[PDB]
């Protein structure tokens, strides 16, 4: 994971927003969307900012928040933080992660500045390393922080099971109706979607997930 001073921002475009793969998390609270309905409530594009911050700074990654890292390192979608004690707390001491301590001006939201220069006033280094250690506490334990940005990427379309020989209310890829589905001996050409009768009535359909031709008979009347 990149440092909080220079986070890794990954944009999402043309994606199937299935959040069930991700959802023990230290903290998980997203604003502007339903936590349990992330698939239905989608946006145009999503940007994921990945950074490593200490546990004591986990509360600073929020909209309207303040802190040493909130106002100078990462200013704020979703705020996902997870424990990384066994992953980032090196026995010899991990100093790969660096955090900014002083800045000329307050950082704009969703804005990051990467620099390695030393400020001259008498020399001060704006970026300081976070010394995560296995003997550190919960607040000083490393935690992987992912920040999502909310702005064409929606959840997968839901599907039900297939029922045959029973009067069902089917919906095959937008072809809706009511009837009794059964195995049909008709041989569709491999580019066709459904069939029609001499009176322009539907007589068959191809299952979008099984590629089988299902005869359709109306429910008895």
């Amino acid at each position: 994971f990149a440092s909080v001073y220079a986070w890794n921002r990954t944009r999402i475009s043309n994606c199937v927003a299935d959040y069930s793969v991700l959802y023990p998390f230290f903290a998980f609270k997203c604003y502007g969307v339903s936590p349990t309905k992330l698939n239905d409530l989608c946006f145009t594009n999503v940007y994921a900012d990945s950074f490593v911050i200490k546990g004591n700074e986990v509360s600073q990654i929020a909209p309207g928040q303040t802190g040493n890292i909130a106002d100078y390192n990462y200013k704020l979608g979703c705020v996902i933080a997870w424990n990384s004690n066994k992953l980032d707390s090196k026995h010899s001491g991990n100093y790969d992660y660096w955090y900014r301590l002083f800045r000329k001006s307050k950082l704009k939201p969703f804005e990051r500045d990467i620099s390695t220069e030393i400020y001259q006033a008498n020399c001060y280094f704006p970026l300081q390393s976070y010394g995560f250690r296995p003997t550190y506490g919960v607040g000083h334990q490393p935690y992987r922080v992912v920040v999502l940005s909310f702005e064409t990427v929606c959840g997968p379309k839901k599907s039900t099971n297939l029922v045959k020989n029973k009067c069902v209310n089917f919906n095959f890829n937008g072809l809706t109706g009511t009837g009794v589905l059964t195995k049909s001996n008709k041989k569709f050409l491999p580019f066709q979607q459904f069939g029609r009768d001499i009176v322009d009535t539907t007589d068959a359909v191809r299952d979008p997930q099984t590629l089988e031709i299902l005869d359709i008979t109306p429910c008895s009347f």
Partner: antibody, heavy 120, light 108 residues
Framework: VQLVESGGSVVQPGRALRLSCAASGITFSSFGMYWVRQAPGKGLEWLGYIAYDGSDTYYADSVKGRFTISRDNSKNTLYLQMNSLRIEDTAVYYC????????????????WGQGTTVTV | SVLTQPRSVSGSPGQSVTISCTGTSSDVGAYNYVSWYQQHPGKAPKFMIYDVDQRPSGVPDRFSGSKSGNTASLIISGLQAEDEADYYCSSYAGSYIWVFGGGTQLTV
């Protein structure tokens, strides 16, 4: 960067008194400034702070609307304009320099002045 | 909004004493920006401990401390006769405003 604070004097209550502290060198514009007061027989009380650029000004609620802190970027000097000073507003005023340069506000005071005593 | 601290803390050379200041969750229990300073009579306070568990350059390592919940404590080990001074703590009250404790006297 040594800080020399002067201007302390005895005045009648309700008068306006300005406390000015002078920095050493030309590093005053390179770091922030803060004001702290010390009443006799009590601890230290924070009065306010000033950003390195002199634009962002913050002060405590108890000193809101009465005490004004100003700094000179060219002369490396700062001022503390206290208005409507009361009888109980008698304390030693000292200036504190931020440990980190620019705008950090996440560090203690590195350099502290001698302190100017104000009585009423 | 000044964090309350004990009026005085006993001590002796060659031993260790703990000086603590207590506030509320608004400042002490919200931000980990606890700072401690050592003040001598007739002189301005000198910063010794900052950021809960950090010390500035030139300050002896004997001055340390820890914070838990809404209570901030400063622990001095191997105190000497010259270390007797009035210690005061600081915490970030938010909105770019800081507050200082009542002030605890350290004895020798």
């Amino acid at each position: 960067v040594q800080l020399v604070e002067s201007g302390g004097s005895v005045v009648q209550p309700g008068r306006a008194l300005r406390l000015s502290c002078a920095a050493s060198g030309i590093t005053f514009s390179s770091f922030g400034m803060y004001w702290v007061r010390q009443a006799p027989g009590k601890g230290l009380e924070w009065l306010g702070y000033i950003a390195y650029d002199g634009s962002d000004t913050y002060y405590a609620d108890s000193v809101k609307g009465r005490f004004t802190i100003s700094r000179d970027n060219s002369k490396n000097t700062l001022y503390l304009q206290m208005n409507s000073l009361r009888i109980e507003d008698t304390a030693v005023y000292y200036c504190a320099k931020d440990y980190y340069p620019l705008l950090s506000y996440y560090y203690g005071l590195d350099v502290w002045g001698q302190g100017t005593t104000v009585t009423v | 909004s000044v964090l309350t601290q004990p009026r005085s803390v006993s001590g002796s050379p060659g031993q260790s004493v703990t000086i603590s200041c207590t506030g509320t969750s608004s400042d002490v229990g919200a931000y980990n920006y606890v700072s401690w300073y050592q003040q001598h009579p007739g002189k301005a306070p000198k910063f010794m401990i900052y950021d809960v568990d950090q010390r500035p350059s030139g300050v002896p390592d004997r001055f340390s401390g820890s914070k838990s919940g809404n209570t901030a404590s400063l622990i001095i080990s191997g105190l000497q006769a010259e270390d007797e001074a009035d210690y005061y703590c600081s915490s970030y009250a938010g909105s770019y405003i800081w507050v200082f404790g009542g002030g605890t006297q350290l004895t020798v």
